[PDB]
């Protein structure tokens, strides 16, 4: 399948080269997979989700995304226009309040929630969790992410936006999950992207168009935007049977575009998420 005039990041994920504008992908499109977006919520009524999104948990007075961040990330995973995996099932877990913040205790509870809740959902092609969030190093947060991964969920987490080594941030620094840095449309490391040995992969993160609340769209930047590209890619590849939740991060790194990025510090992987789709 071909989506013309796609957001640059979608085109990038299906290309060996920067500078193209069509997203190419197998029409299976993540059908039969599930992606949990652990964030500020998801505006499930957005036409872009086509009934494939739903809120399943909140820790606040409402399950509504009153921020937009979670809706944007969910859109990059799985919206019809802005998403990588256009037929996946999206589940929202609102661990972040409408100011975009959450206590680590709440974030941990949300991760453990997903590890259990997947057993309540129909995800025959597998389960992914996208965590466009984080703060300073916490062994408890990292352990929660490790448990979620161990439970059979492909966990993708943001590296962070500190232009610093991700070793000092969580859940970015948990080795066993898929830690995602950000790039721009010219294949530069995004200016704010964290780096370091713990990064597994980069995805598009600067100037990413996706869904927003009030049935709208906008372009924003962050490792929060890169992460759902990788989560959606994992779901897509799992539907194709190319990999599993346990192995998808490694598979994505194995099959990435290698050496394309600039300003990658010595010791950080130079790997850009790529679907290797050949029509």
């Amino acid at each position: 399948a071909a989506q013309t005039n796609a957001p640059w990041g979608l085109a990038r994920i299906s290309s060996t080269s920067p500078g193209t504008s069509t997203y190419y992908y197998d029409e299976s499109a993540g059908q039969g997979s599930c992606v949990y977006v652990i964030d500020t919520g998801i505006e499930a009524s957005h036409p872009e989700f086509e009934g494939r999104a739903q809120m399943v948990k909140t820790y606040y007075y409402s399950s509504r995304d009153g921020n937009g961040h979670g809706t944007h990330c969910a859109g990059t995973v799985g919206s019809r226009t802005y998403g990588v995996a256009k037929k996946t099932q999206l589940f929202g877990v609102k661990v972040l309040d409408d100011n975009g913040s959450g206590q680590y205790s709440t974030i941990i509870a949300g991760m453990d929630f997903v590890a259990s809740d997947k057993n309540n959902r129909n995800c025959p092609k597998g389960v992914v969790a996208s965590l466009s969030l984080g703060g300073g190093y916490s062994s408890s947060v990292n352990s929660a992410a490790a448990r979620l991964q161990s439970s059979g969920v492909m966990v993708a987490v943001a590296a962070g936006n500190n232009n610093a080594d991700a070793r000092n941030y969580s859940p970015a620094s948990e080795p066993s999950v898929c830690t995602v840095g950000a790039s721009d449309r010219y294949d530069r490391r995004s200016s704010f992207s964290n780096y370091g040995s713990v990064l597994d992969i980069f995805g598009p993160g600067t100037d990413i168009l996706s869904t927003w609340i009030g049935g709208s769209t906008r372009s924003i930047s962050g490792t929060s935007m890169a992460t759902p590209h990788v989560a959606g890619l994992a779901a897509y590849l799992m539907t194709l049977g190319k990999t599993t939740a346990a192995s998808a991060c490694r598979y994505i790194a194995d099959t990435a575009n290698k050496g394309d990025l600039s300003n990658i510090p010595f010791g950080t992987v130079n790997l850009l998420a790529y679907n290797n789709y050949q029509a």
Binding site: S101, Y104, L133, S221
Partner: peptide, 7 residues
């Protein structure tokens, strides 16, 4: 404490 903002 938190994610990477409202964005």
């Amino acid at each position: 404490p938190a994610p990477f903002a409202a964005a």
